[PDB]
């Protein structure tokens, strides 16, 4: 809508207060004009019809419990946009400031969130397996990174290339969590998964096997579930990425960490320069090595740590 850019205040899913960018024209809408061509948040009102209605509010105050997922989806889309702009010089997901759109209150008791090809969608959860999914910044950034992947490498959502696709979203979802820097960890979804159980998460990058996910190529899932295990075999790549950043010894191979910034720069380059739609794990290794070579030299510690980390998870 056309109006005056302004600032509202609201409470998110976890009860924390934040400021959000809004647009005023009779109502106050969740439209943020300060970022590229805009961030737009919609109410799907418990239906599956998308996008729903652009979020309208009478007083620019978003403290109703019904408002909370909209506040978070809107605010964390913001932070994610900022991460890509400030750290990798990418303007929105298409690289040309495309509008970011999100719908919340999608369906009823829906325990997921997804990028549908054109927008993010967030369920409310059923109140015991999940609370509203936009409450976790790693989740929001994971979903938005899918949009990024679709516009660059375009990894097919199947088998190994799908696992890479999922791993890239977890990796940057985690980097974005560290960027916004409030309780960052190497777990996925910990803020919104099982509200009545502390210490757990949906997936772990530091130890994927914690939840039964492979952490070595020899343990990869080769059946047909989950599109050939795109959320399962990603644990192998997630583990490599964790090692590259933080270091450690894994299956007897030792890896010197090079830290988060470099891991981000390497994986973003691999993603935007060398990965293609059918890249498999072995090609991801070559892409990451080549990336680190471009950035730090063939005989750097960085190239050596990348090699170390893929040897550790059994990927040649
Ligand atoms: Ca209000
Ligand atoms: Ca966290
Ligand atoms: Ca996390
Ligand atoms: Ca939990
Ligand atoms: Zn995903």
Swiss-Prot record:
Binding site for Zn(2+): 142, 146, 166
Record GO cellular component, one term: extracellular region
Residues the entry annotates as binding Ca(2+) 1: 57, 59, 61
GO molecular function, one term: metal ion binding
Residues of the active site: 143, 231
Cofactor note: Binds 4 Ca(2+) ions per subunit.
Localization per Swiss-Prot or TrEMBL: Secreted
Thermal dependence of catalysis: Thermostable.
Binding site for Ca(2+) 3: 177, 183, 185, 190
Residues binding Ca(2+) 4, per UniProt: 193-194, 197, 200
Family, similarity comment: Belongs to the peptidase M4 family.
Function of the molecule: Extracellular zinc metalloprotease.
Protein name as annotated: Thermolysin
Primary gene name: npr
